[PDB]
Protein backbone atom coordinates (compact mmCIF):
# COMPACT_ATOMS: atom_id res chain seq x y z
CA UNK A 1 0.00 0.00 0.00
CA UNK A 2 0.73 3.72 0.13
CA UNK A 3 3.17 5.24 2.71
CA UNK A 4 4.37 8.55 4.13
CA UNK A 5 7.15 10.08 6.16
CA UNK A 6 6.67 13.35 8.01
CA UNK A 7 8.62 15.51 10.37
CA UNK A 8 6.79 17.90 12.78
CA UNK A 9 8.53 20.73 14.67
CA UNK A 10 7.11 23.05 17.36
CA UNK A 11 8.97 26.00 18.77
CA UNK A 12 7.42 28.08 21.54
CA UNK A 13 8.91 31.34 22.87
CA UNK A 14 9.12 31.73 26.57
CA UNK A 15 9.87 35.43 27.26
CA UNK A 16 11.87 35.82 30.51
CA UNK A 17 12.23 32.06 31.03
CA UNK A 18 15.08 31.35 28.56
CA UNK A 19 15.41 29.93 24.99
CA UNK A 20 12.32 28.72 23.08
CA UNK A 21 10.96 25.22 23.88
CA UNK A 22 11.73 23.14 20.74
CA UNK A 23 10.30 19.65 20.01
CA UNK A 24 10.80 17.69 16.81
CA UNK A 25 9.16 14.35 15.98
CA UNK A 26 9.39 12.12 12.92
CA UNK A 27 6.80 9.59 11.76
CA UNK A 28 6.56 6.89 9.07
CA UNK A 29 2.84 6.40 8.39
CA UNK A 30 1.34 6.31 11.89
CA UNK A 31 4.46 5.18 13.69
CA UNK A 32 6.73 7.71 15.53
CA UNK A 33 10.40 6.89 15.12
CA UNK A 34 12.51 9.81 16.30
CA UNK A 35 12.32 12.68 18.76
CA UNK A 36 14.26 15.69 19.95
CA UNK A 37 13.31 17.81 22.93
CA UNK A 38 15.38 20.89 23.79
CA UNK A 39 14.45 20.55 27.48
CA UNK A 40 15.66 16.98 27.81
CA UNK A 41 19.01 16.16 29.32
CA UNK A 42 20.50 14.21 26.38
CA UNK A 43 20.43 16.92 23.72
CA UNK A 44 20.36 14.18 21.08
CA UNK A 45 17.92 12.95 18.50
CA UNK A 46 16.48 9.83 20.12
CA UNK A 47 14.90 6.61 18.75
CA UNK A 48 11.20 5.97 19.37
CA UNK A 49 10.66 2.79 17.27
CA UNK A 50 12.80 -0.35 17.64
CA UNK A 51 13.71 -0.68 13.96
CA UNK A 52 15.59 2.66 13.94
CA UNK A 53 17.70 1.73 17.04
CA UNK A 54 20.12 -0.20 14.86
CA UNK A 55 20.99 2.72 12.55
CA UNK A 56 24.34 3.45 14.25
CA UNK A 57 26.35 6.49 15.40
CA UNK A 58 26.76 8.16 12.01
CA UNK A 59 22.98 8.34 11.80
CA UNK A 60 22.42 9.60 15.34
CA UNK A 61 25.28 12.09 15.34
CA UNK A 62 24.16 13.54 11.94
CA UNK A 63 20.47 13.61 12.81
CA UNK A 64 21.40 15.28 16.15
CA UNK A 65 23.38 17.95 14.26
CA UNK A 66 20.53 18.52 11.70
CA UNK A 67 17.80 18.73 14.33
CA UNK A 68 19.79 21.21 16.38
CA UNK A 69 20.20 23.30 13.19
CA UNK A 70 16.40 23.22 12.84
CA UNK A 71 16.07 24.38 16.48
CA UNK A 72 18.27 27.33 15.85
CA UNK A 73 16.47 28.42 12.71
CA UNK A 74 13.16 28.43 14.62
CA UNK A 75 14.79 30.39 17.41
CA UNK A 76 15.67 33.09 14.85
CA UNK A 77 12.18 32.70 13.24
CA UNK A 78 10.35 33.61 16.45
CA UNK A 79 12.27 36.90 16.53
CA UNK A 80 11.64 37.46 12.79
CA UNK A 81 7.83 36.82 13.03
CA UNK A 82 7.49 39.06 16.11
CA UNK A 83 9.05 41.84 14.01
CA UNK A 84 6.81 41.10 11.01
CA UNK A 85 3.61 41.19 13.11
CA UNK A 86 4.79 44.15 15.31
CA UNK A 87 4.28 42.04 18.41
CA UNK A 88 5.55 42.74 21.95
CA UNK A 89 8.51 40.97 23.58
CA UNK A 90 6.26 39.86 26.47
CA UNK A 91 3.97 37.31 24.83
CA UNK A 92 4.61 33.65 24.04
CA UNK A 93 4.18 32.67 20.43
CA UNK A 94 4.27 29.38 18.44
CA UNK A 95 5.91 28.41 15.16
CA UNK A 96 5.10 25.06 13.71
CA UNK A 97 6.71 23.41 10.72
CA UNK A 98 5.90 20.16 8.85
CA UNK A 99 7.62 18.56 5.95
CA UNK A 100 7.76 15.21 4.23
CA UNK A 101 6.77 12.92 1.44
CA UNK A 102 4.18 10.37 0.30
CA UNK A 103 4.85 7.38 -1.95
CA UNK A 104 2.05 5.45 -3.71
CA UNK A 105 1.47 1.77 -3.77
CA UNK A 106 4.33 1.39 -6.30
CA UNK A 107 6.60 3.04 -3.69
CA UNK A 108 7.28 5.90 -6.19
CA UNK A 109 7.21 9.55 -5.18
CA UNK A 110 3.60 10.82 -5.13
CA UNK A 111 3.44 14.12 -3.16
CA UNK A 112 5.71 16.31 -1.12
CA UNK A 113 5.04 18.98 1.56
CA UNK A 114 6.74 21.77 3.43
CA UNK A 115 4.62 24.18 5.44
CA UNK A 116 4.64 26.59 8.40
CA UNK A 117 2.05 27.97 10.77
CA UNK A 118 2.40 30.88 13.17
CA UNK A 119 0.30 30.91 16.34
CA UNK A 120 -2.00 28.15 15.02
CA UNK A 121 -2.68 29.51 11.55
CA UNK A 122 -1.29 28.81 8.03
CA UNK A 123 1.69 31.07 7.45
CA UNK A 124 3.38 29.62 4.31
CA UNK A 125 3.14 26.32 2.39
CA UNK A 126 4.91 24.83 -0.57
CA UNK A 127 2.42 24.13 -3.33
CA UNK A 128 1.90 20.69 -4.83
CA UNK A 129 4.02 21.53 -7.90
CA UNK A 130 6.89 22.01 -5.45
CA UNK A 131 7.71 25.17 -7.37
CA UNK A 132 5.51 27.86 -5.81
CA UNK A 133 4.36 29.12 -2.39
CA UNK A 134 1.02 29.85 -0.83
CA UNK A 135 1.12 32.78 1.54
CA UNK A 136 -2.07 34.30 3.04
CA UNK A 137 -0.84 37.10 5.33
CA UNK A 138 0.76 40.34 4.24
CA UNK A 139 3.60 39.47 6.62
CA UNK A 140 3.94 36.15 4.99
CA UNK A 141 4.66 37.74 1.57
CA UNK A 142 7.99 38.95 2.81
CA UNK A 143 8.88 35.31 3.50
CA UNK A 144 7.53 34.20 0.11
CA UNK A 145 9.61 36.79 -1.74
CA UNK A 146 12.74 35.96 0.31
CA UNK A 147 12.22 32.29 -0.51
CA UNK A 148 11.54 32.85 -4.22
CA UNK A 149 14.79 34.86 -4.45
CA UNK A 150 16.84 32.28 -2.53
CA UNK A 151 15.35 29.37 -4.57
CA UNK A 152 14.25 27.51 -1.49
CA UNK A 153 11.61 25.54 -3.42
CA UNK A 154 14.24 24.05 -5.79
CA UNK A 155 16.27 22.78 -2.82
CA UNK A 156 13.17 21.41 -1.19
CA UNK A 157 12.08 19.77 -4.47
CA UNK A 158 15.39 17.78 -4.71
CA UNK A 159 15.06 16.60 -1.09
CA UNK A 160 11.35 15.62 -1.22
CA UNK A 161 11.69 13.80 -4.55
CA UNK A 162 15.06 12.15 -3.81
CA UNK A 163 16.44 11.81 -0.25
CA UNK A 164 13.08 11.92 1.49
CA UNK A 165 11.52 9.00 -0.44
CA UNK A 166 14.80 7.02 -0.53
CA UNK A 167 15.05 7.13 3.23
CA UNK A 168 11.30 6.33 3.55
CA UNK A 169 11.97 3.23 1.50
CA UNK A 170 14.96 2.28 3.63
CA UNK A 171 12.85 2.63 6.78
CA UNK A 172 10.00 0.61 5.23
CA UNK A 173 12.46 -2.19 4.45
CA UNK A 174 14.28 -2.02 7.83
CA UNK A 175 11.08 -1.84 9.86
CA UNK A 176 9.05 -4.19 7.68
CA UNK A 177 7.69 -6.13 10.74
CA UNK A 178 6.36 -2.80 12.22
CA UNK A 179 5.66 -0.62 9.17
CA UNK A 180 4.49 -3.08 6.57
CA UNK A 181 2.11 -4.88 9.05
CA UNK A 182 -1.60 -4.35 9.55
CA UNK A 183 -3.36 -5.11 12.82
CA UNK A 184 -7.04 -5.84 12.16
CA UNK A 185 -9.56 -4.29 14.49
CA UNK A 186 -10.75 -6.54 17.21
CA UNK A 187 -14.40 -5.66 17.56
CA UNK A 188 -17.31 -5.81 20.05
CA UNK A 189 -20.51 -4.09 21.09
CA UNK A 190 -21.84 -2.92 24.39
CA UNK A 191 -25.47 -2.21 25.28
CA UNK A 192 -26.48 0.14 28.07
CA UNK A 193 -29.92 1.36 29.11
CA UNK A 194 -30.55 5.11 29.13
CA UNK A 195 -34.15 4.59 30.33
CA UNK A 196 -37.00 2.10 29.78
CA UNK A 197 -37.63 3.11 26.18
CA UNK A 198 -34.18 3.36 24.57
CA UNK A 199 -30.59 2.12 24.88
CA UNK A 200 -27.10 2.99 23.64
CA UNK A 201 -25.47 0.46 21.32
CA UNK A 202 -21.72 1.19 21.03
CA UNK A 203 -19.57 -0.55 18.38
CA UNK A 204 -15.86 -0.79 19.34
CA UNK A 205 -12.71 -1.28 17.24
CA UNK A 206 -9.57 -2.01 19.22
CA UNK A 207 -5.88 -2.79 18.55
CA UNK A 208 -5.82 -1.80 14.95
CA UNK A 209 -2.98 -0.38 12.86
CA UNK A 210 -2.85 1.84 10.89
CA UNK A 211 -5.18 4.48 12.20
CA UNK A 212 -7.35 5.00 9.15
CA UNK A 213 -10.71 3.29 9.79
CA UNK A 214 -14.40 3.62 8.95
CA UNK A 215 -16.90 2.73 11.57
CA UNK A 216 -20.59 3.41 10.74
CA UNK A 217 -24.12 2.38 11.83
CA UNK A 218 -27.05 1.64 9.59
CA UNK A 219 -30.76 1.19 10.43
CA UNK A 220 -32.49 -1.14 7.95
CA UNK A 221 -29.41 -0.52 5.77
CA UNK A 222 -29.83 3.25 5.80
CA UNK A 223 -26.89 5.26 6.99
CA UNK A 224 -27.33 6.83 10.41
CA UNK A 225 -24.82 9.61 10.07
CA UNK A 226 -26.66 12.40 11.86
CA UNK A 227 -27.64 10.13 14.68
CA UNK A 228 -24.30 8.43 15.36
CA UNK A 229 -21.90 9.58 18.00
CA UNK A 230 -18.41 9.04 16.68
CA UNK A 231 -15.27 9.71 18.73
CA UNK A 232 -11.83 10.65 17.45
CA UNK A 233 -9.48 7.67 16.72
CA UNK A 234 -7.13 7.49 19.75
CA UNK A 235 -3.84 5.73 20.58
CA UNK A 236 -3.77 2.72 22.88
CA UNK A 237 -0.19 3.55 23.82
CA UNK A 238 1.33 0.41 22.26
CA UNK A 239 1.38 1.51 18.63
CA UNK A 240 -2.24 0.52 18.01
CA UNK A 241 -5.42 2.57 17.76
CA UNK A 242 -9.02 2.54 19.17
CA UNK A 243 -12.32 4.03 18.03
CA UNK A 244 -15.98 3.64 18.81
CA UNK A 245 -19.40 4.61 17.36
CA UNK A 246 -22.76 4.61 19.17
CA UNK A 247 -26.49 4.98 18.25
CA UNK A 248 -29.58 5.26 20.44
CA UNK A 249 -31.81 2.29 19.79
CA UNK A 250 -35.42 2.53 20.93
CA UNK A 251 -37.00 -0.58 22.46
CA UNK A 252 -37.23 -3.74 20.42
CA UNK A 253 -35.22 -2.34 17.62
CA UNK A 254 -31.71 -3.77 18.12
CA UNK A 255 -32.20 -6.11 15.10
CA UNK A 256 -32.61 -3.08 12.73
CA UNK A 257 -29.16 -1.77 13.41
CA UNK A 258 -25.85 -2.94 11.92
CA UNK A 259 -22.40 -1.62 12.64
CA UNK A 260 -20.09 -1.56 9.53
CA UNK A 261 -16.28 -1.71 9.96
CA UNK A 262 -13.78 -0.99 7.11
CA UNK A 263 -10.10 -1.37 7.67
CA UNK A 264 -7.03 -2.45 5.69
CA UNK A 265 -6.41 -5.32 8.18
CA UNK A 266 -9.78 -6.98 7.51
CA UNK A 267 -10.07 -9.65 4.77
CA UNK A 268 -13.55 -8.24 4.13
CA UNK A 269 -15.53 -5.35 5.78
CA UNK A 270 -17.49 -6.47 8.88
CA UNK A 271 -21.24 -6.20 9.50
CA UNK A 272 -22.01 -6.56 13.19
CA UNK A 273 -25.44 -6.84 14.83
CA UNK A 274 -26.52 -7.13 18.45
CA UNK A 275 -28.26 -10.49 18.56
Amino acid sequence: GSHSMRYFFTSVSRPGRGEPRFIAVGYVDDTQFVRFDSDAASQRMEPRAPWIEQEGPEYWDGQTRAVKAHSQTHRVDLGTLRGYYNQSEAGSHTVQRMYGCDVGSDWRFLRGYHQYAYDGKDYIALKEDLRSWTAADMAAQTTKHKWEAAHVAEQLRAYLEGTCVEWLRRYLENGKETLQRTDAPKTHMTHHAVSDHEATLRCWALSFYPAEITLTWQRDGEDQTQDTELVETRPAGDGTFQKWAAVVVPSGQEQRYTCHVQHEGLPKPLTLRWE
Binding site: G26, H70, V76
Partner: peptide, 9 residues
Protein backbone atom coordinates in the same frame (compact mmCIF):
# COMPACT_ATOMS: atom_id res chain seq x y z
CA UNK B 1 16.33 11.62 7.31
CA UNK B 2 16.01 15.31 7.91
CA UNK B 3 16.35 18.08 5.27
CA UNK B 4 19.95 19.28 5.57
CA UNK B 5 19.77 22.94 4.67
CA UNK B 6 18.80 26.00 6.74
CA UNK B 7 15.52 27.77 5.98
CA UNK B 8 14.62 31.09 7.64
CA UNK B 9 11.22 32.84 7.42
Amino acid sequence: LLFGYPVYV
